[PDB]
Coordinates of C-alpha atoms in Angstrom, one line a residue:
Chain A
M1296 CA -30.5 -10.9 -5.1
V1297 CA -31.7 -9.1 -2.0
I1298 CA -30.6 -5.5 -1.9
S1299 CA -30.6 -2.8 0.9
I1300 CA -33.3 -0.1 1.0
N1301 CA -33.4 3.3 2.6
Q1302 CA -37.1 2.7 2.5
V1303 CA -39.2 1.1 -0.2
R1304 CA -37.9 1.1 -3.8
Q1305 CA -40.0 0.6 -6.9
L1306 CA -38.8 -0.2 -10.4
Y1307 CA -40.5 0.5 -13.8
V1308 CA -39.2 -1.0 -17.0
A1309 CA -39.3 1.6 -19.8
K1310 CA -39.6 -0.5 -23.0
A1311 CA -41.3 2.2 -25.0
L1312 CA -41.9 5.9 -24.3
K1313 CA -45.2 7.4 -25.2
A1314 CA -46.7 10.9 -24.9
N1315 CA -50.3 10.2 -23.7
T1316 CA -52.1 7.9 -21.3
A1317 CA -54.2 6.7 -24.3
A1318 CA -51.1 5.5 -26.3
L1319 CA -50.2 2.9 -23.6
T1320 CA -51.0 -0.3 -25.4
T1321 CA -48.2 -2.9 -24.9
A1322 CA -46.5 -4.3 -21.8
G1323 CA -43.5 -2.1 -21.1
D1324 CA -44.9 1.3 -22.2
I1325 CA -44.3 4.3 -20.0
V1326 CA -45.2 8.0 -19.9
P1327 CA -44.0 10.6 -17.4
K1328 CA -47.0 12.6 -16.2
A1329 CA -47.0 15.9 -14.4
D1330 CA -48.9 19.1 -13.9
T1331 CA -48.7 22.4 -15.6
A1332 CA -47.6 23.8 -12.2
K1333 CA -44.9 21.1 -11.8
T1334 CA -45.8 20.2 -8.2
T1335 CA -46.4 16.4 -8.7
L1336 CA -44.7 13.8 -10.9
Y1337 CA -45.8 10.3 -11.4
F1338 CA -45.2 7.6 -14.0
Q1339 CA -48.1 6.0 -15.8
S1340 CA -47.0 2.7 -17.3
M1341 CA -48.6 -0.4 -18.9
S1342 CA -48.4 -3.4 -16.7
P1343 CA -48.8 -6.9 -18.3
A1344 CA -52.5 -6.7 -17.0
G1345 CA -53.5 -3.1 -17.7
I1346 CA -52.5 0.5 -17.0
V1347 CA -50.8 1.2 -13.6
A1348 CA -49.6 4.5 -12.3
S1349 CA -46.6 5.0 -10.0
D1350 CA -46.4 6.9 -6.8
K1351 CA -46.8 10.7 -6.8
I1352 CA -43.5 12.4 -6.4
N1353 CA -43.6 15.8 -4.8
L1354 CA -41.3 17.8 -6.9
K1355 CA -40.3 20.0 -4.0
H1356 CA -39.3 16.9 -2.0
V1357 CA -36.7 15.3 -4.2
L1358 CA -33.3 14.5 -2.8
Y1359 CA -31.3 13.4 -5.8
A1360 CA -31.9 12.1 -9.4
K1361 CA -29.1 10.6 -11.3
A1362 CA -28.9 8.3 -14.4
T1363 CA -26.3 5.5 -14.6
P1364 CA -25.0 4.1 -17.9
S1365 CA -24.6 0.5 -18.7
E1366 CA -20.8 0.5 -18.8
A1367 CA -20.8 1.8 -15.2
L1368 CA -22.6 -1.3 -14.1
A1369 CA -20.5 -3.8 -16.1
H1370 CA -18.1 -5.9 -14.0
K1371 CA -14.5 -5.8 -15.3
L1372 CA -13.0 -9.3 -15.1
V1373 CA -9.7 -9.4 -13.2
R1374 CA -6.6 -10.4 -15.3
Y1375 CA -3.3 -11.6 -13.9
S1376 CA -0.2 -11.8 -16.1
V1377 CA 2.1 -14.6 -14.9
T1378 CA 5.8 -14.3 -16.1
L1379 CA 9.1 -15.7 -15.1
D1380 CA 11.0 -13.4 -12.6
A1381 CA 13.9 -11.9 -14.5
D1382 CA 15.9 -11.4 -11.3
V1383 CA 15.7 -15.1 -10.4
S1384 CA 16.3 -16.4 -14.0
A1385 CA 14.8 -15.4 -17.3
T1386 CA 15.2 -19.0 -18.5
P1387 CA 14.0 -22.1 -16.7
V1388 CA 16.9 -23.6 -14.7
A1389 CA 17.1 -27.3 -15.5
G1390 CA 15.8 -30.0 -13.2
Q1391 CA 13.8 -27.7 -10.9
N1392 CA 10.0 -28.1 -10.3
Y1393 CA 8.0 -25.0 -11.1
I1394 CA 4.8 -25.1 -9.0
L1395 CA 2.2 -22.4 -9.1
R1396 CA -0.5 -22.0 -6.4
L1397 CA -3.7 -20.1 -7.5
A1398 CA -5.3 -19.0 -4.3
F1399 CA -9.1 -18.6 -4.6
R1400 CA -10.6 -16.6 -1.7
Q1401 CA -14.4 -16.6 -2.0
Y1402 CA -15.0 -20.2 -3.2
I1403 CA -18.4 -21.6 -2.7
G1404 CA -19.1 -20.1 0.7
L1405 CA -19.6 -16.4 1.2
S1406 CA -16.5 -15.5 3.3
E1407 CA -12.8 -15.1 2.9
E1408 CA -12.4 -18.1 5.2
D1409 CA -13.8 -20.5 2.5
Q1410 CA -10.8 -20.9 0.3
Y1411 CA -9.6 -23.1 -2.5
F1412 CA -6.3 -23.8 -4.3
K1413 CA -5.5 -25.1 -7.8
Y1414 CA -2.0 -26.1 -8.7
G1415 CA 0.1 -26.3 -11.9
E1416 CA 3.5 -27.9 -12.1
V1417 CA 6.3 -28.0 -14.6
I1418 CA 9.7 -29.7 -14.1
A1419 CA 12.1 -27.9 -16.3
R1420 CA 14.4 -29.5 -18.9
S1421 CA 17.9 -29.0 -20.2
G1422 CA 16.9 -27.1 -23.4
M1423 CA 13.6 -25.6 -22.2
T1424 CA 13.3 -21.9 -23.2
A1425 CA 11.0 -19.3 -21.7
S1426 CA 8.2 -19.9 -24.3
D1427 CA 8.3 -23.7 -23.9
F1428 CA 8.0 -23.1 -20.1
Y1429 CA 4.8 -20.9 -20.6
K1430 CA 3.4 -23.5 -23.0
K1431 CA 3.8 -26.4 -20.6
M1432 CA 2.7 -24.2 -17.6
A1433 CA -0.5 -23.2 -19.3
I1434 CA -1.2 -26.8 -20.5
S1435 CA -0.8 -28.0 -16.9
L1436 CA -2.9 -25.1 -15.4
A1437 CA -5.8 -25.7 -17.8
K1438 CA -5.6 -29.5 -17.2
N1439 CA -6.2 -28.9 -13.5
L1440 CA -8.6 -25.9 -13.7
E1441 CA -10.7 -26.3 -16.8
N1442 CA -11.6 -30.0 -16.6
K1443 CA -15.1 -30.5 -18.1
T1444 CA -16.5 -32.3 -15.0
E1445 CA -15.7 -29.5 -12.5
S1446 CA -18.5 -28.0 -10.5
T1447 CA -17.9 -24.4 -11.7
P1448 CA -15.3 -22.8 -13.9
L1449 CA -12.8 -20.8 -11.9
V1450 CA -10.4 -18.9 -14.2
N1451 CA -9.5 -18.7 -17.9
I1452 CA -5.9 -19.3 -19.1
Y1453 CA -4.5 -17.4 -22.1
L1454 CA -1.0 -17.4 -23.6
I1455 CA 0.3 -14.3 -25.4
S1456 CA 2.6 -14.5 -28.3
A1457 CA 5.3 -11.8 -28.2
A1458 CA 4.8 -11.1 -31.9
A1459 CA 1.0 -10.6 -31.4
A1460 CA 1.1 -9.1 -27.9
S1461 CA -2.6 -8.2 -27.8
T1462 CA -4.5 -11.3 -28.9
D1463 CA -5.2 -13.9 -26.3
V1464 CA -4.3 -17.5 -27.2
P1465 CA -6.9 -19.6 -25.4
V1466 CA -5.6 -22.7 -23.6
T1467 CA -8.1 -25.4 -22.5
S1468 CA -7.8 -28.9 -21.2
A1469 CA -8.5 -30.3 -24.7
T1470 CA -5.7 -28.1 -26.1
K1471 CA -2.6 -30.0 -27.1
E1472 CA 0.8 -28.3 -27.5
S1473 CA 0.6 -29.5 -31.2
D1474 CA -1.9 -26.7 -31.5
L1475 CA 0.3 -24.1 -29.7
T1476 CA 3.1 -23.6 -32.3
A1477 CA 4.3 -20.1 -31.6
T1478 CA 7.9 -19.9 -30.4
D1479 CA 7.8 -16.5 -28.7
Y1480 CA 5.6 -16.6 -25.5
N1481 CA 6.2 -14.0 -22.9
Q1482 CA 3.4 -14.4 -20.3
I1483 CA 0.5 -16.5 -19.1
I1484 CA -2.7 -14.6 -18.5
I1485 CA -5.0 -15.9 -15.8
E1486 CA -8.4 -14.2 -15.9
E1487 CA -11.5 -14.8 -13.8
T1488 CA -14.7 -16.1 -15.3
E1489 CA -18.4 -15.4 -14.9
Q1490 CA -20.3 -17.6 -12.5
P1491 CA -23.8 -19.0 -13.2
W1492 CA -26.9 -17.1 -12.4
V1493 CA -30.6 -17.9 -11.6
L1494 CA -32.9 -14.9 -11.2
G1495 CA -33.7 -14.3 -7.6
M1496 CA -32.3 -17.5 -6.4
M1497 CA -28.6 -17.2 -7.4
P1498 CA -27.1 -13.6 -7.4
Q1499 CA -24.2 -12.5 -9.7
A1500 CA -21.0 -13.4 -7.8
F1501 CA -17.4 -13.8 -8.5
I1502 CA -14.5 -15.9 -7.1
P1503 CA -11.4 -13.7 -6.9
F1504 CA -7.9 -15.1 -7.1
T1505 CA -4.1 -14.5 -6.8
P1506 CA -1.3 -16.6 -8.3
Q1507 CA 1.4 -17.7 -5.8
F1508 CA 4.7 -19.3 -6.5
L1509 CA 6.7 -22.0 -4.7
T1510 CA 10.4 -21.6 -4.3
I1511 CA 13.1 -23.2 -6.6
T1512 CA 16.7 -23.9 -5.7
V1513 CA 18.5 -21.6 -8.2
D1514 CA 22.1 -21.2 -7.1
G1515 CA 21.8 -22.9 -3.7
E1516 CA 19.1 -20.3 -2.9
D1517 CA 15.4 -21.0 -2.5
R1518 CA 13.9 -18.3 -4.7
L1519 CA 10.3 -18.0 -5.8
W1520 CA 10.4 -18.3 -9.5
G1521 CA 7.9 -15.8 -10.9
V1522 CA 6.0 -12.6 -10.5
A1523 CA 2.3 -12.1 -11.1
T1524 CA 1.0 -8.6 -11.9
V1525 CA -2.5 -7.4 -12.6
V1526 CA -2.9 -6.1 -16.2
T1527 CA -5.7 -3.8 -17.3
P1528 CA -9.1 -5.6 -17.9
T1529 CA -10.2 -6.3 -21.4
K1530 CA -13.6 -8.1 -20.8
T1531 CA -16.8 -7.0 -19.1
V1532 CA -19.7 -8.9 -17.7
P1533 CA -22.8 -7.1 -19.1
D1534 CA -25.6 -5.5 -17.1
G1535 CA -28.4 -7.8 -17.9
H1536 CA -28.0 -10.3 -15.1
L1537 CA -28.0 -7.5 -12.6
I1538 CA -31.1 -5.6 -13.7
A1539 CA -33.3 -8.7 -13.9
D1540 CA -32.4 -9.4 -10.3
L1541 CA -33.1 -5.7 -9.5
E1542 CA -36.6 -6.2 -11.1
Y1543 CA -37.2 -9.6 -9.3
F1544 CA -36.8 -7.9 -6.0
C1545 CA -38.7 -4.6 -6.8
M1546 CA -41.7 -6.6 -8.0
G1547 CA -42.6 -7.6 -4.5
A1548 CA -42.9 -4.0 -3.3
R1549 CA -45.7 -3.5 -5.9
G1550 CA -46.7 -7.1 -6.4
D1551 CA -46.5 -10.4 -4.5
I1552 CA -44.0 -11.1 -1.8
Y1553 CA -44.9 -14.8 -1.8
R1554 CA -43.0 -15.7 -5.0
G1555 CA -43.5 -19.4 -5.7
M1556 CA -43.8 -20.6 -2.2
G1557 CA -46.9 -22.9 -2.2
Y1558 CA -46.2 -23.5 -5.8
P1559 CA -49.5 -24.0 -7.7
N1560 CA -51.2 -21.7 -5.2
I1561 CA -49.3 -18.6 -6.2
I1562 CA -49.7 -15.4 -8.2
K1563 CA -47.2 -15.4 -11.0
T1564 CA -45.6 -12.0 -11.9
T1565 CA -44.6 -11.2 -15.5
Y1566 CA -41.1 -9.6 -15.6
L1567 CA -40.3 -7.2 -18.5
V1568 CA -36.5 -7.3 -18.3
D1569 CA -34.8 -9.5 -20.9
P1570 CA -31.7 -10.8 -19.0
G1571 CA -29.6 -10.9 -22.2
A1572 CA -29.9 -7.1 -22.8
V1573 CA -28.1 -4.2 -21.2
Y1574 CA -30.0 -1.4 -19.4
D1575 CA -29.5 2.1 -18.1
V1576 CA -30.8 3.0 -14.6
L1577 CA -32.4 6.2 -13.3
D1578 CA -32.9 6.6 -9.6
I1579 CA -35.3 9.4 -8.5
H1580 CA -34.9 9.5 -4.7
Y1581 CA -37.6 11.5 -2.9
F1582 CA -39.5 11.7 0.3
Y1583 CA -42.8 12.6 2.0
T1584 CA -43.5 14.8 5.0
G1585 CA -46.8 15.0 6.8
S1586 CA -48.9 18.1 7.7
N1587 CA -48.1 19.4 11.2
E1588 CA -46.2 17.0 13.5
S1589 CA -45.6 14.2 11.0
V1590 CA -42.4 15.9 9.8
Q1591 CA -40.4 12.7 9.6
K1592 CA -39.4 11.9 6.0
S1593 CA -40.4 8.7 4.2
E1594 CA -37.3 8.6 1.9
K1595 CA -38.1 6.3 -1.0
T1596 CA -37.0 5.9 -4.6
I1597 CA -38.5 5.1 -8.0
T1598 CA -36.2 3.2 -10.4
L1599 CA -36.5 3.3 -14.2
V1600 CA -34.6 1.0 -16.5
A1601 CA -34.4 1.5 -20.3
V1602 CA -32.6 -0.8 -22.8
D1603 CA -29.8 1.0 -24.6
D1604 CA -28.0 0.2 -27.8
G1605 CA -24.5 1.6 -27.8
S1606 CA -25.3 5.3 -27.6
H1607 CA -27.9 5.7 -24.9
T1608 CA -31.0 6.4 -27.1
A1609 CA -33.9 5.2 -25.0
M1610 CA -32.6 6.7 -21.7
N1611 CA -31.8 10.1 -23.0
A1612 CA -35.3 10.3 -24.5
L1613 CA -36.7 9.1 -21.2
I1614 CA -34.8 11.8 -19.3
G1615 CA -35.8 14.4 -21.9
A1616 CA -39.4 13.5 -21.3
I1617 CA -39.0 13.7 -17.5
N1618 CA -37.1 17.0 -17.6
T1619 CA -39.7 18.9 -19.7
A1620 CA -42.6 17.5 -17.6
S1621 CA -41.1 17.8 -14.1
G1622 CA -39.0 20.9 -14.5
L1623 CA -36.1 18.9 -13.2
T1624 CA -32.5 19.0 -14.4
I1625 CA -31.5 15.4 -14.6
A1626 CA -28.2 15.2 -16.5
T1627 CA -28.2 13.2 -19.8
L1628 CA -25.7 10.3 -20.0
Chain B
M925 CA 23.9 -27.8 0.1
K926 CA 24.4 -31.5 -0.9
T927 CA 26.9 -33.3 1.3
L928 CA 28.7 -36.5 0.2
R929 CA 30.2 -38.8 2.8
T930 CA 31.6 -41.6 0.6
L931 CA 34.0 -42.1 -2.3
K932 CA 33.5 -45.2 -4.4
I933 CA 36.1 -47.0 -6.6
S934 CA 34.2 -48.8 -9.3
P935 CA 34.3 -49.1 -13.1
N936 CA 30.5 -48.9 -13.0
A937 CA 28.7 -45.8 -11.8
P938 CA 27.9 -45.7 -8.0
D939 CA 24.8 -44.4 -6.4
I940 CA 24.3 -40.7 -7.0
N941 CA 25.2 -39.7 -3.4
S942 CA 28.7 -41.1 -3.8
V943 CA 31.9 -40.0 -5.6
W944 CA 32.8 -42.0 -8.7
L945 CA 36.6 -42.9 -8.7
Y946 CA 38.0 -44.8 -11.7
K947 CA 41.8 -44.9 -12.4
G948 CA 42.4 -41.2 -12.1
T949 CA 39.2 -39.4 -13.1
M950 CA 36.9 -38.2 -10.3
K951 CA 33.2 -37.7 -10.9
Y952 CA 30.2 -36.6 -8.9
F953 CA 26.5 -36.5 -9.6
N954 CA 25.2 -32.9 -10.0
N955 CA 22.1 -31.6 -11.9
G956 CA 21.2 -35.1 -13.2
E957 CA 24.6 -35.8 -14.7
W958 CA 27.9 -37.4 -13.6
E959 CA 30.2 -34.3 -13.7
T960 CA 33.9 -34.8 -14.4
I961 CA 36.3 -33.1 -12.0
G962 CA 39.3 -31.9 -13.9
Chain C
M54 CA 15.6 23.9 31.5
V55 CA 17.3 23.8 34.9
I56 CA 20.9 25.0 34.6
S57 CA 23.8 25.0 37.1
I58 CA 24.2 28.5 38.5
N59 CA 27.0 30.4 40.1
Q60 CA 24.5 31.6 42.7
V61 CA 22.5 33.5 40.1
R62 CA 22.1 33.9 36.3
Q63 CA 19.8 36.6 34.8
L64 CA 19.0 36.8 31.1
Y65 CA 18.1 40.1 29.3
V66 CA 17.1 40.1 25.7
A67 CA 18.7 42.7 23.4
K68 CA 16.0 42.7 20.7
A69 CA 16.8 46.3 19.8
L70 CA 19.6 48.5 21.0
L71 CA 35.9 38.4 36.5
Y72 CA 35.3 37.7 32.9
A73 CA 33.1 39.1 30.0
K74 CA 33.0 37.2 26.7
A75 CA 30.6 37.0 23.8
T76 CA 29.6 33.6 22.4
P77 CA 28.7 33.2 18.7
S78 CA 25.8 31.2 17.5
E79 CA 28.0 28.7 15.7
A80 CA 29.5 27.8 19.0
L81 CA 26.1 26.9 20.5
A82 CA 25.0 24.9 17.5
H83 CA 25.1 21.1 18.2
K84 CA 26.8 19.6 15.1
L85 CA 24.8 16.4 14.4
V86 CA 27.1 13.4 14.3
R87 CA 27.5 11.7 11.0
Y88 CA 28.5 8.0 10.5
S89 CA 29.6 6.8 7.1
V90 CA 28.7 3.1 6.5
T91 CA 30.6 1.2 3.7
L92 CA 31.5 -2.3 2.8
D93 CA 35.1 -3.0 3.8
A94 CA 37.4 -4.2 1.1
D95 CA 39.2 -6.6 3.4
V96 CA 36.2 -8.9 3.4
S97 CA 34.7 -8.1 -0.1
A98 CA 33.9 -5.2 -2.3
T99 CA 30.9 -7.2 -3.7
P100 CA 28.0 -8.4 -1.5
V101 CA 28.4 -12.1 -0.9
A102 CA 25.5 -13.7 -2.6
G103 CA 24.2 -16.0 0.1
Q104 CA 24.6 -13.9 3.2
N105 CA 22.2 -11.9 5.3
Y106 CA 23.6 -8.4 5.8
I107 CA 22.4 -6.9 9.1
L108 CA 23.2 -3.5 10.6
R109 CA 22.6 -2.8 14.2
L110 CA 22.3 0.7 15.6
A111 CA 22.9 0.8 19.3
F112 CA 21.2 3.9 20.7
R113 CA 21.8 5.4 24.1
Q114 CA 19.8 7.7 26.4
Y115 CA 16.7 6.6 24.5
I116 CA 13.9 7.7 26.9
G117 CA 15.6 8.1 30.3
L118 CA 18.9 9.8 31.0
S119 CA 21.4 6.9 31.3
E120 CA 23.5 5.0 28.9
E121 CA 21.7 1.9 30.2
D122 CA 18.6 3.1 28.3
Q123 CA 19.6 1.3 25.1
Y124 CA 17.5 1.1 22.0
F125 CA 18.3 -1.2 19.1
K126 CA 17.0 -0.6 15.6
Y127 CA 18.0 -2.9 12.8
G128 CA 18.3 -2.8 9.0
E129 CA 18.8 -5.9 6.9
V130 CA 19.2 -6.9 3.3
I131 CA 19.9 -10.4 1.9
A132 CA 22.3 -10.2 -1.0
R133 CA 21.7 -11.8 -4.4
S134 CA 23.7 -13.1 -7.2
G135 CA 23.5 -10.0 -9.4
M136 CA 23.7 -7.5 -6.6
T137 CA 26.3 -4.7 -7.0
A138 CA 27.8 -2.4 -4.4
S139 CA 25.3 0.3 -5.3
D140 CA 22.4 -2.1 -5.2
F141 CA 23.5 -3.0 -1.6
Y142 CA 23.7 0.6 -0.4
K143 CA 20.3 1.4 -2.0
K144 CA 18.5 -1.6 -0.5
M145 CA 19.9 -1.2 3.0
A146 CA 19.1 2.6 3.1
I147 CA 15.6 1.6 2.1
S148 CA 15.6 -1.0 4.9
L149 CA 17.1 1.4 7.5
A150 CA 14.5 4.1 6.6
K151 CA 11.5 1.8 7.0
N152 CA 12.6 1.0 10.6
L153 CA 14.0 4.4 11.7
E154 CA 12.1 7.1 9.8
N155 CA 8.6 5.6 9.5
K156 CA 5.2 7.0 10.5
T157 CA 4.7 5.0 13.7
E158 CA 7.9 5.7 15.7
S159 CA 7.2 7.9 18.8
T160 CA 10.4 9.9 18.5
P161 CA 12.9 10.9 15.7
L162 CA 16.1 8.7 15.9
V163 CA 18.4 9.3 12.9
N164 CA 18.6 10.6 9.4
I165 CA 19.5 8.3 6.5
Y166 CA 21.2 9.6 3.4
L167 CA 22.7 8.0 0.3
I168 CA 25.8 9.6 -1.2
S169 CA 26.3 9.1 -4.9
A170 CA 29.7 8.7 -6.4
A171 CA 29.1 11.4 -9.0
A172 CA 27.7 13.8 -6.4
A173 CA 30.0 13.3 -3.3
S174 CA 29.0 16.5 -1.5
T175 CA 25.2 16.0 -2.1
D176 CA 23.3 13.6 0.1
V177 CA 19.9 12.4 -1.1
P178 CA 17.4 11.9 1.7
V179 CA 15.8 8.5 2.2
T180 CA 12.6 8.1 4.2
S181 CA 10.1 5.2 4.6
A182 CA 8.0 6.6 1.8
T183 CA 11.0 6.5 -0.5
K184 CA 10.8 3.6 -2.9
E185 CA 13.5 2.0 -5.0
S186 CA 12.3 3.7 -8.2
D187 CA 13.2 7.1 -6.7
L188 CA 16.8 6.0 -6.1
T189 CA 17.6 5.9 -9.8
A190 CA 21.4 6.2 -9.7
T191 CA 23.7 3.2 -10.1
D192 CA 26.8 4.7 -8.4
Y193 CA 26.2 4.7 -4.6
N194 CA 29.4 4.4 -2.6
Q195 CA 28.3 4.8 1.0
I196 CA 25.4 5.3 3.4
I197 CA 25.3 8.2 5.9
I198 CA 23.4 7.8 9.2
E199 CA 23.1 11.2 11.0
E200 CA 21.6 12.2 14.3
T201 CA 18.4 14.2 14.6
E202 CA 16.9 17.0 16.6
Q203 CA 14.5 15.6 19.2
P204 CA 11.2 17.2 20.2
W205 CA 11.3 20.3 22.3
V206 CA 8.8 21.8 24.7
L207 CA 9.6 25.3 26.2
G208 CA 10.8 24.7 29.8
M209 CA 9.2 21.3 30.1
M210 CA 11.3 19.2 27.7
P211 CA 14.9 20.3 27.2
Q212 CA 17.1 20.0 24.1
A213 CA 18.7 16.6 24.4
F214 CA 19.9 14.0 21.9
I215 CA 20.0 10.2 21.4
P216 CA 23.5 9.1 20.5
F217 CA 23.9 6.0 18.4
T218 CA 26.6 3.6 17.2
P219 CA 26.2 1.6 13.9
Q220 CA 27.4 -1.9 14.4
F221 CA 27.7 -4.8 12.1
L222 CA 26.9 -8.5 12.3
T223 CA 29.1 -11.3 10.9
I224 CA 28.8 -12.6 7.3
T225 CA 30.4 -15.9 6.2
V226 CA 33.1 -15.1 3.8
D227 CA 35.1 -18.3 2.9
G228 CA 33.9 -20.5 5.7
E229 CA 34.9 -17.9 8.3
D230 CA 32.6 -15.3 9.9
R231 CA 33.7 -11.7 9.5
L232 CA 32.1 -8.3 10.0
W233 CA 30.8 -6.9 6.7
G234 CA 31.4 -3.2 7.1
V235 CA 33.1 -0.1 8.5
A236 CA 31.5 2.8 10.2
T237 CA 33.5 6.1 10.2
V238 CA 32.7 9.4 12.0
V239 CA 33.1 11.9 9.1
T240 CA 32.9 15.6 9.7
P241 CA 29.4 17.0 10.4
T242 CA 27.5 19.1 7.9
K243 CA 24.2 20.3 9.4
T244 CA 23.7 21.6 13.0
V245 CA 20.9 22.4 15.4
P246 CA 20.1 26.1 15.9
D247 CA 20.3 28.2 19.1
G248 CA 16.6 29.1 19.3
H249 CA 15.6 26.1 21.4
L250 CA 18.6 26.5 23.8
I251 CA 18.2 30.2 24.4
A252 CA 14.4 30.2 24.9
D253 CA 14.8 27.5 27.6
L254 CA 17.6 29.5 29.1
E255 CA 15.5 32.7 29.0
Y256 CA 12.6 30.6 30.5
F257 CA 14.9 29.7 33.4
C258 CA 16.8 32.9 34.1
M259 CA 13.8 35.1 34.1
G260 CA 12.5 33.3 37.2
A261 CA 15.5 34.8 38.9
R262 CA 13.6 38.2 38.6
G263 CA 10.0 37.4 38.7
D264 CA 7.7 34.4 39.0
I265 CA 9.2 31.1 40.2
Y266 CA 5.8 29.3 40.3
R267 CA 5.4 29.4 36.5
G268 CA 2.1 27.7 35.9
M269 CA 1.4 25.9 39.2
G270 CA -2.2 26.4 40.0
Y271 CA -3.2 27.5 36.5
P272 CA -6.2 29.9 37.0
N273 CA -4.2 31.7 39.7
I274 CA -0.9 32.6 38.1
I275 CA 1.2 35.5 36.9
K276 CA 1.9 35.1 33.2
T277 CA 5.3 36.4 32.1
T278 CA 5.9 37.6 28.6
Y279 CA 9.0 35.9 27.1
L280 CA 11.0 37.9 24.6
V281 CA 12.9 35.1 22.8
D282 CA 11.7 33.6 19.6
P283 CA 12.7 29.9 19.3
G284 CA 12.8 30.2 15.5
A285 CA 16.0 32.4 15.4
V286 CA 19.6 32.0 16.2
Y287 CA 21.2 34.0 19.0
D288 CA 24.6 35.3 19.9
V289 CA 25.2 35.3 23.6
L290 CA 27.1 37.7 25.8
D291 CA 28.0 36.5 29.3
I292 CA 29.4 38.9 32.0
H293 CA 30.4 37.2 35.2
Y294 CA 30.9 39.5 38.2
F295 CA 30.6 39.5 42.0
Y296 CA 30.1 41.4 45.2
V297 CA 34.4 39.5 52.9
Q298 CA 33.1 36.6 51.0
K299 CA 32.3 37.2 47.3
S300 CA 28.9 36.4 45.9
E301 CA 29.5 35.7 42.2
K302 CA 26.8 36.9 39.7
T303 CA 26.1 36.5 36.0
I304 CA 24.3 38.5 33.3
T305 CA 23.4 36.9 30.0
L306 CA 22.6 39.1 27.0
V307 CA 21.2 37.5 23.8
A308 CA 20.7 39.2 20.4
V309 CA 19.6 37.9 17.0
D310 CA 22.2 36.6 14.6
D311 CA 21.5 37.4 10.9
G312 CA 24.6 35.5 9.7
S313 CA 27.1 38.1 10.4
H314 CA 27.6 38.9 14.1
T315 CA 25.8 42.3 14.1
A316 CA 23.8 43.3 17.2
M317 CA 26.3 41.5 19.4
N318 CA 29.3 43.1 17.8
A319 CA 27.0 46.1 18.2
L320 CA 27.0 45.4 22.0

């Protein structure tokens, strides 16, 4: 995952916070060092091959410093609630074919011009109610979408029982309608899923979607049979696949830019981000100006990531160690 | 909507685009059923 | 603006104190024409569920001066099975307002109102920003399309108006095509004030005594202070006199109208 830079950006994983240079013993330790005059801030840390210090931040030449929680960096998956249009008919009219076109927009390619469509179809019956429609619609959608031998999963299908109204009933291709026994179904939730991820090589990306409806002949009138509204999101993609890509890039500004290229003839870098753990990010953005005529700024930033467990314990202690050393006023998340 | 151009006199049922005429009852095929006119 | 003169007309402002006659401010207020659009009960009192209902407004004097400068703006609503008479008047007044009173149109054309059956003397305004949630009432009996006041520049763009005629297309009723509605010129309610007609008249008639080259050759001009505020309403006195051959002459005296006719009944 290549990112943009204002100028060079360095990341330091804060796996443990110490109080001296001498206490740095394990890979992932950190200590914010400063003066007693508070004119220079740097971060001594323990690399996987020894102690390494960061750049020296002039505390007069800081632009901003802000700390971002984990839930700010968690992607909310988009949900769409597919119902029958009550103006058209609240019950399925008999003998009509109910086709639904899910329009994917950023399928495999990177643009909106690379598009993809998955269909679901139900021909309504004489005694088919609304819940028996949503049952057969979601069985037909999951049969087309969530086959096992697809290339990537696209969306998740969930019925909702009107008695429950807050618990998602998962519908897959292996699901039969013998398993779906509830008689009060009021919507079909279609919700996007998390794509695969390889660190550095495949970034975190999502394929957005919209459900679209073909018209039915209701009373001699070609009316589109349903409406699709976007309900509030109830799931989040965690921060871990985003920070490990943020470390894989920012370990070439310190380390090797040739990552893997002539394969046995490489330096291999040890990365201290566990991709299955959430992190909080602190961005100290600062600059350098020269003596007399070298007044152009070299605006750069030093990133710090700390793993946090619910309440942000390790980041608020990191900020509290920076604020007493630097004299800064970084706000605590 | 659906135009019918024939009327068929048969005891059996005709094709669905035709009017079923049998002895005094008229029928026509609508919504998957032969619908009695009367 | 340029007026027709009986060889002269000179305007004097009374800001503080053949025939002679005073004109009230209600006489010089252009009463904006109202048309009331309904569904005629000859065809149907209910919107026919398959038909497209299209209303054509046929404007005249749109940008030029002639009745050959014709502008046509359309509103349309396709009726449904469960549509009532009040759902029709709501959905067409939404459709007329998106075409006529939107953000993009270069000039104001008409005002669109919805009269409710419970509040017959109160007209709710509909604009392009108005959504169907704002029109909450279920008893709407007519749509009112009313003229507007056009933009006005002092002495360069006079007060003029764009007349219109609401016309209806044909809907299929029982296999025959008939017009779906009736437009009726009801009595007008709101007017256009005198401030824009008097300030252009004072702009013209003060060139009779003073500068005729108003702003031609802008750095070398004689700027004339005008004593009419275009944000007021004025009562107008008008004394027509003369001087073997007569040379007829006119004096126009304007004074502010506070609702009663003081300062012109005081003159």
